[PDB]
Design an enzyme around this catalytic site. Structure first.
Site, mmCIF file in Angstrom:
data_model
loop_
_atom_site.group_PDB
_atom_site.id
_atom_site.type_symbol
_atom_site.label_atom_id
_atom_site.label_comp_id
_atom_site.label_asym_id
_atom_site.label_seq_id
_atom_site.Cartn_x
_atom_site.Cartn_y
_atom_site.Cartn_z
ATOM 1 N N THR B 30 0.831 -1.209 0.000
ATOM 2 C CA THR B 30 0.000 0.000 0.000
ATOM 3 C C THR B 30 0.865 1.258 0.000
ATOM 4 O O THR B 30 2.050 1.207 0.317
ATOM 5 C CB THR B 30 -0.958 0.054 1.213
ATOM 6 O OG1 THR B 30 -0.206 0.142 2.429
ATOM 7 C CG2 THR B 30 -1.858 -1.176 1.257
ATOM 8 N N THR B 31 0.261 2.389 -0.351
ATOM 9 C CA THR B 31 0.994 3.645 -0.473
ATOM 10 C C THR B 31 1.271 4.255 0.903
ATOM 11 O O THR B 31 0.390 4.298 1.759
ATOM 12 C CB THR B 31 0.227 4.663 -1.345
ATOM 13 O OG1 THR B 31 -0.200 4.033 -2.561
ATOM 14 C CG2 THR B 31 1.106 5.868 -1.684
#
Ligand SMILES: [Cl-]
Lengths: 241, 243, 240, 195, 235, 244, 231, 250, 111
Positions: B30-31
């Site tokens: 995920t970012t």
């Protein structure tokens, strides 16, 4: 063909992992240069900050190993910092045990011996770096000693490292063929830095701004790196003659 | 061939393919982002809501080291936790011996050397995380990002994970439009926006926003989580910008 | 330390290293054990490919573990020395801690345990040796004869053979040895042991070794001439 | 324990050792055999601190018996005595030394000669025609110095030994409950059941 | 080659699955639990007639209230039995009581997965652990090299296991007597064995609260074999 | 991990042989021939140096014959460096025995100890075995004059006469033909040199290509003397026996 | 393929196959359900037998008076991990006089499992765990995967056919969370949830295993006729 | 971590060859030529200073090394391997001899210790053999002057004269014709320079050639006076000027 | 020199009835001539219907009780919630005490 994966001999008597560690040395695409003056030793290196999000002050391949010894590295930064931390520890231990500052050539040999072990012992890989140590030694004077992944090391009148090392090397060779001396006959370190930058410009065929270069200077009893503004002053003097 | 089967083996290129494969695990995660502001730093992360059964605000991803350093990472979450546990040991021994809390550049090298050590032998696997971290020390604010190879640099803004390109583009605009600098409260708002904009790369599932910050003025140089009204204010600002 | 797992299971449920150790035993010279009513005899083959040998000093095939127990073997010679040494140390260790000499069954169980340990320990290979352990328990007149093998299993035998062409001499023993009436005397027991080896040995000269063990620590090795008399008598009866 | 004596005559070695064992103020046993057969032609008597004596003797016995089985050969008395000395010299610098004094009586079948070795707990070895440990020698050596010849018979050796025990029984404050006597010669080891 | 502790794509440990194949090659062992006791029986399977069959010890005492039968690479069982006996007697030392059959079984099974690169491989032997305690009464357990143990009313392990287990499926009920169980083990052993069953190539044993663990004499078993033959000929 | 690169030096073949031991023996079969002959009044050790040079300093050179103690010597066939590791261990073992028992070590006990060390490298440790075969020539008061051999497997055997190294098949046949039990040292010396002269791969057998030694009770009265022959002495015995 | 020989090897796409194979062992395991309210937390487990003569393998393990878990996969690995939890719960009590927080217990399990995924020679754990507990911040439910990932949830399910129970809980979320001060109704919701994962077989008296912990309720396991009430 | 390579990396192949030793010898063959000649009153060892770059100061790289005051060494093959062997050789001369007997070891025994170290790298776990062949010249009271060769296997042989590396085959033939048992040290140096010229391509002078001798005692190089028995080192490295002087009479 | 032991006073009393048992102890804790506490519990309910008191050096007493309570907990885990009988607890405590034979728990214990 597992003789190419670990540091054992191939049928030709070669160590392929050592040879491939030499190739990792040029992964950064940075060229470095080192020269000696009368009272000083100068080292310059290209600085490339491709990303705008980077803090350019933290991007460096020049290290202050001890008060007297400086080191520039050609190779990936993780291995460079690994070597830098070890050299700092070794320099400090030497002073504690033997009561005097570790000479540049002795540190170079010590790091070269550590590198040799990685070429002989299987579980340890070579570091993909070439280490150039510089100082003004109290016995030998201005000193340049360079180490590589093979565990080889030697002293230098001047030297160059990187993808375009040959162009820089020949340029320096031709200058010392004229002057017929083993150093830059100059009093101030400022002018020795100007010489170093000028001859890198000529050899590579590129102009430099203040942020394109990185400079390290060794004098008696201290090694220090130049700021961007110190380098700018150097670039102005070059352009005005 | 066979050079990519074992860690710490140089390929004929001079590359360590196992480290490059570890990067693929980071790119799959995920970012997460980091923003350096006037007197501190802000960290933010995308938390994918896999199911309604996930308890909101409980599965905390951002971690504190000592009391002044924040750490966030993308990739294999357990690997990140392992790295933070080591970071906490490094920070403790530093303070034990030297009294002062560990400086951020000093802390950065402690993590760097440890991660780099996991690229030296075939008996260990490289870390499957890129870690964004930083905080406030005696010399001011510092933001760092550390890769699987052990490589790290200082940053004005940093981003990693699946939506790193989108994030980086947004961070580059802030650097250009604010040469004088960005305030801490602004950085929190901007951090929320960037995570929301970067969520277009993970647009299948909806997500939860998590933010933290260290600031000399706003938090007394201590790491704190952004909670309640200040978090909602940042979410509202972020939602307004995407529409 | 070297920890590599050499003895491991294969898809069909076999430990090949243990099975290949049995092939080393198959290569070894033949050894035979026969127990009579009041004795046990251990016979051993000596391959005659090696002449110019000094038989005084050459390691004998039968080894005393204690004054009342003996051990012969088939397989790797060097490997057998390690088991024999361990067995001899354990025999003295038992006398020292328990104040009784080892029983033949106990000594066998120990040697078998050592062999087993080398089939599931890291960095080691199994012993390429099967042993025949014979003797009499302290203050007991019942003969004892046990066998061990690389896997570490052991069992008691009325008569048994191991080594090369052991299949043939076992065939002989199975039809010639009667359980209801075993070799009543020493002569009959030795004769049956020599007969069994003559099925395989080649020449009955210096190729056959015989060691008789009787109760109360009475162990003797027969000489060449004594064995040669058995060889002569057997074939003269055979010419009929 | 207390008194152990030894005498080497023409064709044998004779060892005499006391029978008493005392715990506190009570004599627990008056028939204790302070000796171990190391090999068929080698006998070792011992005296020292409680417990250590038997443990050391049995440890030596096990080692010599192990050697005998391994080589199918009996070590010479000299070789055994050297092995024992090294173990005691090794022991004296240990964390807790073994406080044991020994006499080793053996008949060397190769040289056809009896041999007596005296070794104390420090690892001090001496070959002697007659020997003792502790205070035993203070009472007995004057008699042995006077009466001993190297060509004595086993019977004459026993008579001189009786005279030594009689002197001990007269002048020692200590009741050691008589001695067990054993003879070591070419035929092996045997005990004199009436003394 | 490959790791000793490696998982297969199906989520099973290769070595544990391969050790189970070795156990299938072993001689048959059967256990039946009743309210009057637990019966344990084994196939001896002598490789030659000269081998003295009474020296084949595939049924073993762990404590007075716990017995054990084995199948597979029987040499591997010796260290397991040694540990079990130590665990049983050690618990009696620490707690002045008999140890629970389940707790003993668990202690044996804790050794199972202690292998890697500890021992170099899993055990190649399965155990039927039968016993009695005051809390759970008469119990029969099946201990595998996977570290898993199941309790059973009746269980067969070894080469004729699936054929014997199907037979135990039909025959077992909760009201079985000890005598009925004895004959039932003999019946099923005789069915799956290659050679003809007699007192010399098969062995019986039981565990009762009163008398504890007992291995049956060859004379006692011979009578039970004769009693079996007559009752099968009765219809 | 590291497993990938492990050759596994201590394993059985499907036929029940030890790969590395068999290959070590193959190595030894290319080494210079060494011969030992036991007589009633002494023992002879003869050995051939491998293709030498004229510039090799022979009088200070030693590649074949080594002294373990005053009573025992060895002839080497195989890797000289491997042999020196074992030789120094054996020298220490002999001195340990002498310190412990105050008697010179019996020949067999020394041989068994070295053979046990070789054995260990074939069963555990994951290391390559020693590529060495020894001929032990020695004397003690139990068995008198003795000849033994040991090889990389750690197996040892006693001999009246024996050869190791190159052309042992041919050499053993020649020894088996001319050897007799009532033979003496001077005769055994001649047999050893004649056997080498016929089995050698060289064009001619000369003094500079040989190492020679005897163990004789030909020492003044009941005692044993070791004689490592000098280059000039090897040259004389070659003329005496009628080879050059 | 070429990158699944050991746990120390990434694949070209950044995957760890040995960990994924360990995850596969959980899917083969029998179904177990976890769910909680604000007052109580419940575990429901479908036990599996070898055959009709055999007993039903136990699925639920107690770790402390206020904490316990249910397993799915390799049972011996659950014993090792539950033993570790018992020790950690116990270390917290003896040293700090403090009941171990359920969230911290999850962090400890994550870190223990992780070490086995990065080192040579060892292997990942082949078991999944559902941890329930009641601490100073109320009721909790955790899901443990042997990759190291630990997740706090309102409800979940792991094992074969666990997707059916997980969907049910996702629908019932708003209902069962509100079941406060009623242990029997919360168990009913768990028994109804695990029923969505059943095929062919149904919940019998020696098949079903239930555990509960709450505000004034120590961790207790219900088996045998104690669960006949809920069938 | 931990060194998990506890197994041998050098093993016997079916033909009986030890591959890694053979390959190490191949690396030695590629190396620059070095030689040694023994005279009646001394020994000489010599090699070419193959400079990797003209900017490099070749004086700082010493191919000929002092091991003890009376023992010197030169090599052919991998330089780094040689450097660490010299460090170990110098140390073992002290630990396993001088600290025991109070004097420096004789040549043959120091060679024996170096040989042992090289043998262990051929059998021990997780290492490759050293990729060098050494030529060790030395003097001691009871053995006189001596010259030894040491190979990657750990085998060592005494020589009257020899050469190793690039052009060893041709150089050994050249030495066979010129060597005799009546050579003086100056004659040996002259032959060494003649032999070495054949293998050198480029510049041939004192700055490109490294040469040392084991000869007479040098009391001027001792560093102190007052002890009659201490007369100075027999090892001496010839200067650039001293080499050039002998190249005029060449 | 550091003395690792101390004396916290107190007195305990255990009496066994036909179908009951009592364990009594005073609540005073002291050092030398001072009172530390007038109410410091000394007799504890250790579970499984067992009561315990370790009288003497309080630090060692608290450590022993704490370890026995721990032993009861692990007895339930390891043996299927079986009740620890009083005789089994007594034997278990013997081994807890003798583990320190050469640096003892300086307490007189009654259960
Ligand atoms: Cl170094």
């Amino acid at each position: 063909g597992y003789d190419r994966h670990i540091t054992i001999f191939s049928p030709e008597g070669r160590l392929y992992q050592v040879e491939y560690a030499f190739k990792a040395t040029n992964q950064t695409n940075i060229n470095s240069l080192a020269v000696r003056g009368k009272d000083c030793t100068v080292v310059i290196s290209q600085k490339k900050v491709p990303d705008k999000l980077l803090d350019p002050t933290t991007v460096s391949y020049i290290f202050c190993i001890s008060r007297t010894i400086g080191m520039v590295v050609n190779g990936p930064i993780p291995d460079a910092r690994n070597a830098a931390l070890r050299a700092k520890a070794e320099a400090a231990e030497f002073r504690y045990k033997y009561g005097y500052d570790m000479p540049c050539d002795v540190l170079a040999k010590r790091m070269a011996n550590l590198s040799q072990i990685y070429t002989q012992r299987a579980y340890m890989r070579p570091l993909g770096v070439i280490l150039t140590f510089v100082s003004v030694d109290e016995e030998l004077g201005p000193s340049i000693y360079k180490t590589d992944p093979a565990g080889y090391y030697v002293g230098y009148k001047a030297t160059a490292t990187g993808p375009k090392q040959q162009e820089i090397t020949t340029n320096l060779e031709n200058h010392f063929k004229k002057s017929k001396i083993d150093h830059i006959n100059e009093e101030s370190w400022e002018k020795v830095v100007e010489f170093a930058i000028t001859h890198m410009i000529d050899a590579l065929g590129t102009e430099f701004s203040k942020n394109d270069l990185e400079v390290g200077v060794a004098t008696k009893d201290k090694f220090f790196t130049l700021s961007a503004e110190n380098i700018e002053e150097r670039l102005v003097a070059i352009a005005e003659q | 061939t066979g050079y990519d089967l074992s860690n710490s083996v140089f390929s004929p290129d001079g590359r360590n393919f196992q480290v490059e494969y570890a990067v693929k695990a980071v790119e799959n995660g995920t970012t997460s982002i980091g923003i350096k502001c006037n007197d501190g730093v802000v960290f933010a992360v995308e938390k994918l809501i896999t199911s309604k059964l996930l308890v909101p605000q409980k599965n905390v991803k951002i971690q504190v080291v000592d009391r002044h350093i924040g750490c966030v990472y993308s990739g294999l979450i357990p690997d990140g936790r392992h790295l933070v546990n080591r970071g906490r040991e490094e920070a403790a021994s530093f303070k034990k011996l030297y009294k002062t809390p560990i400086p951020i550049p000093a802390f950065a090298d402690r993590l760097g050397q440890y991660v780099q050590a996991h690229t030296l032998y075939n008996s260990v696997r490289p870390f499957g995380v890129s870690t964004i971290f930083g905080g406030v020390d005696k010399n001011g604010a510092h933001l760092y990002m550390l890769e699987p190879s052990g490589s790290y640099w200082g940053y004005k803004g940093a981003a990693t994970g699946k939506g790193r390109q989108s994030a980086k583009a947004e961070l580059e605009k802030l650097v250009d439009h604010h040469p004088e600098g960005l305030s801490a409260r602004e950085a929190v708002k901007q951090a929320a926006k960037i995570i929301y904009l970067a969520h277009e790369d993970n647009k299948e599932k909806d997500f939860e926003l998590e933010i933290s910050w260290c600031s000399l003025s706003e938090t007394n140089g201590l790491h704190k989580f952004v909670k309640g009204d200040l978090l909602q204010e940042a979410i509202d600002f972020a939602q307004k910008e995407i529409n | 330390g070297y920890d590599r797992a050499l003895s491991i299971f294969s898809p069909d449920g076999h430990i090949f290293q243990v099975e290949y150790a049995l092939e080393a035993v198959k290569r070894g010279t033949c050894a035979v054990g026969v127990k009579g009513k009041n004795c046990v005899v251990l016979g051993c083959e000596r391959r005659s490919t090696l002449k110019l040998q000094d038989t005084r000093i050459t390691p004998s095939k039968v080894s005393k573990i204690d004054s009342h127990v003996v051990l012969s073997f088939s397989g790797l010679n060097a490997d057998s020395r390690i088991l024999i040494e361990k067995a001899r140390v354990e025999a003295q260790s038992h006398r020292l801690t328990l104040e009784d000499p080892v029983t033949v069954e106990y000594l066998t169980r120990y040697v078998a345990g050592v062999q087993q340990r080398y089939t599931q320990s890291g960095g080691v290979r199994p012993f390429g040796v099967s042993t025949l352990i014979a003797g009499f328990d302290p203050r007991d007149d019942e003969p004892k004869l046990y066998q061990t093998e690389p896997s570490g299993i052991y069992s008691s035998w009325s008569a048994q053979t191991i080594g090369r062409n052991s299949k043939t001499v076992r065939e002989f023993l199975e039809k010639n040895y009667d359980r209801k009436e075993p070799p009543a005397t020493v002569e009959e027991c030795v004769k049956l042991t020599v007969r069994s080896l003559l099925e395989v040995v080649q020449t009955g000269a210096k190729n056959i070794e015989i060691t008789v063990v009787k109760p109360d620590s009475d162990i003797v090795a027969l000489s060449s001439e004594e064995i040669n008399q058995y060889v002569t008598q057997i074939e003269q009866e055979k010419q009929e | 324990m207390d008194i152990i004596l030894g005498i080497r005559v023409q064709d044998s070695v004779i060892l005499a050792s006391s029978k008493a064992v005392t715990r506190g103020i009570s004599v627990l046993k008056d028939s204790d055999d302070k000796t171990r057969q190391l090999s068929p032609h080698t006998l070792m008597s011992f005296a020292g601190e409680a417990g250590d004596t038997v443990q050391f003797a049995e440890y030596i016995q096990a080692n010599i018996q192990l050697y005998s089985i391994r080589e199918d050969y009996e070590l010479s008395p000299q070789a055994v005595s050297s092995f024992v000395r090294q173990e005691l010299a090794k022991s004296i610098r240990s964390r807790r030394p073994y406080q044991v004094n020994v006499l080793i009586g053996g008949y060397d079948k190769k040289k056809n000669k009896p041999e007596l070795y005296q070794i104390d707990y420090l690892g001090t070895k001496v070959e002697l025609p007659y020997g003792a440990h502790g205070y035993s020698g203070f009472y007995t050596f004057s008699l042995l110095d006077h009466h001993y010849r190297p060509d004595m018979t086993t019977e004459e050796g026993l008579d001189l030994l009786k005279l030594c025990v009689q002197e001990l029984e007269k002048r020692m404050p200590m009741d050691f409950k008589g001695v067990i006597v054993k003879i070591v010669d070419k035929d092996g080891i045997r005990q004199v059941d009436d003394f | 080659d490959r790791g000793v502790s490696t998982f297969s794509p199906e989520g099973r440990l290769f070595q544990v699955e391969y050790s189970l194949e070795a156990i299938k090659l072993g001689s048959t062992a059967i256990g039946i639990a009743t309210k009057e006791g637990v019966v344990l029986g084994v196939e001896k399977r002598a490789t030659s007639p000269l081998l003295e069959s009474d020296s084949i010890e595939k049924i073993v005492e762990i404590d007075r209230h716990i017995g054990c039968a084995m199948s597979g690479l029987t040499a591997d069982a010796r260290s397991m039995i040694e540990h079990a006996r130590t665990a049983a007697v050690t618990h009696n030392l620490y707690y002045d009581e008999d140890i629970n059959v389940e707790s003993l079984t668990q202690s044996v099974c804790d050794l199972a997965l202690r292998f890697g690169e500890l021992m170099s491989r899993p055990f190649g032997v399965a155990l039927l652990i039968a016993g009695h305690d005051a809390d759970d009464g008469y119990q029969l357990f099946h201990a595998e090299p996977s570290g898993t143990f199941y309790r059973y009313n009746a269980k067969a392990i070894g080469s004729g296991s699936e054929g014997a287990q199907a037979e135990l499926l039909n025959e077992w009920h909760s009201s079985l007597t000890l005598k009925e169980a004895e004959l039932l083990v003999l019946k099923i052993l005789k069915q799956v064995m290659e050679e003809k069953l007699d007192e010399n190539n098969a062995q019986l044993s039981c565990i009762t609260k009163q008398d504890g663990f007992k291995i049956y004499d060859n004379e006692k078993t011979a009578e039970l074999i004769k009693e079996l033959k007559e009752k099968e000929a009765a219809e | 991990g590291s497993r990938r690169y492990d050759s596994r030096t201590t394993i059985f073949s499907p036929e029940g042989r030890l790969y590395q031991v068999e290959y070590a023996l193959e190595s030894i079969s290319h080494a210079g021939t060494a011969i030992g002959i036991m007589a009633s009044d002494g023992i002879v050790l003869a050995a051939e140096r491998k293709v030498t040079s004229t510039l090799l300093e022979q009088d200070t050179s030693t590649e074949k014959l080594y002294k373990l103690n005053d009573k025992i010597a060895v002839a080497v066939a195989g890797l000289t460096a491997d042999a020196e590791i074992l030789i120094n261990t054996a020298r220490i073992h002999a001195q340990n025995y002498l310190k412990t028992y105050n008697e010179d070590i019996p020949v067999e006990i020394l041989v068994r100890r070295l053979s046990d060390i070789k054995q260990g490298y074939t069963q555990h440790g994951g290391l390559r075995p020693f590529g060495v075969s020894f001929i032990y020539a020695g004397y003690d008061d139990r068995y008198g004059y003795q000849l033994y051999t040991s090889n990389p497997s750690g197996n040892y055997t006693g001999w009246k006469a024996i050869s190791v190294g190159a052309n042992t098949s041919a050499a053993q046949t020649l020894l088996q033909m001319d050897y007799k039990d009532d033979m003496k040292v001077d005769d055994a010396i001649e047999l050893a040199l004649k056997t080498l002269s016929k089995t050698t791969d060289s064009s001619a057998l000369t003094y500079d290509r040989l190492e020679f030694a005897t163990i004789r009770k030909g020492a003044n009265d009941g005692e044993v003397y070791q004689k490592i022959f000098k280059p000039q002495e090897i040259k004389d015995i070659l003329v005496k026996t009628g080879i050059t | 393929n070429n990158y699944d020989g050991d746990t120390v090897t990434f694949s070209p796409t950044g995957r760890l196959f040995q960990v994924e194979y360990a995850l596969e062992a959980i899917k083969q395991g029998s179904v177990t359900v976890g769910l909680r309210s604000n007052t109580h937390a419940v575990l429901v487990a479908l036990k599996r037998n070898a055959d009709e003569l055999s007993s039903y393998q136990k699925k639920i393990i107690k770790c402390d008076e206020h904490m316990g878990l249910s397993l799915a996969g390799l049972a011996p690995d659950a014993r090792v991990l539950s033993n570790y939890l018992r020790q950690q719960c116990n270390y917290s009590s003896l040293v700090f006089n403090r009941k171990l927080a359920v969230e911290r217990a999850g962090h400890l399990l994550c870190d223990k499992a992780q070490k086995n995924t990065q080192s040579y020679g060892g292997r990942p754990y082949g078991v999944g765990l559902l941890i329930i507990g009641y601490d100073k911040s109320g009721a909790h439910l955790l899901e443990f995967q042997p990759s190291g990932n630990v997740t706090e949830l309102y409800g979940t399910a792991i094992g074969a056919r666990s997707q059916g129970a997980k969907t049910y809980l996702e629908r019932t979320l708003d209902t069962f969370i509100k079941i406060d001060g009623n242990p029997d109704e919360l168990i009913k919701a768990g028994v109804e949830a695990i029923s969505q994962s059943l095929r062919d077989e149904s919940l019998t008296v020696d098949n079903l295993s239930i555990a509960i912990v709450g505000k004034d309720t120590p961790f207790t396991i219900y088996d045998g006729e104690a669960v006949a009430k809920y069938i | 971590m931990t060194d998990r390579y506890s197994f041998s990396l050098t093993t016997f192949s079916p033909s009986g060859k030890l591959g890694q030793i053979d390959y190490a010898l191949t690396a030695v063959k590629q190396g620059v030529t070095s030689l040694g000649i023994k005279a009646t009153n001394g020994v000489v060892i010599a090699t070419e200073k193959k400079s990797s770059s003209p900017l490099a100061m070749s004086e700082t790289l010493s191919k000929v090394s002092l091991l003890t005051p009376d023992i010197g060494a030169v090599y052919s093959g991998m330089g780094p391997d040689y450097r660490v062997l010299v460090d170990k050789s110098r140390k073992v001369a002290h630990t396993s001899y001088k600290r025991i007997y109070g004097e420096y070891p004789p040549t043959k025994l120091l060679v024996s210790e170096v040989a042992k170290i090289m043998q262990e790298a051929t059998q021990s776990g997780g290492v490759r053999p050293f990729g060098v062949s050494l030529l060790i010249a030395g003097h001691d009271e009871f053995n006189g002057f001596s010259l030894y060769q040491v190979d990657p296997s750990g085998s060592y042989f005494p020589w009257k004269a020899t050469a190793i590396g690039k052009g060893s085959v041709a150089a050994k033939t050249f030495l066979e014709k010129r060597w005799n048992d009546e050579l003086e040290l100056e004659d040996a140096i002259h032959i060494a320079l003649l032999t070495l010229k054949e293998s050198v391509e480029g510049e041939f002078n004192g700055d490109t050639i490294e040469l040392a001798i084991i000869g007479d005692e040098n009391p001027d190089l001792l560093g102190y006076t007052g002890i009659p028995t201490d007369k100075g080192p027999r090892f001496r490295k010839l200067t650039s000027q001293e080499i050039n002087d002998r190249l005029e009479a060449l | 020199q550091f003395n690792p032991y101390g004396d916290n006073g107190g007195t305990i009393l255990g009496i066994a009835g036909e179908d009951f048992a009592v364990l009594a102890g005073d609540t005073r804790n002291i050092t030398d001539y001072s009172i530390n506490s007038r109410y410091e519990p000394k007799v504890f309910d250790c579970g499984d219907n067992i009561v315990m008191s370790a009288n003497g050096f309080a630090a060692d007493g608290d450590a022993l009780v704490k370890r026995f309570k721990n032993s009861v907990k692990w007895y339930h885990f390891d043996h299927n919630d079986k009740k620890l009988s009083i005789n089994s607890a007594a034997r278990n405590i013997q081994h807890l005490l003798y583990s320190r034979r050469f640096f003892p728990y300086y307490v007189y214990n009654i259960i």
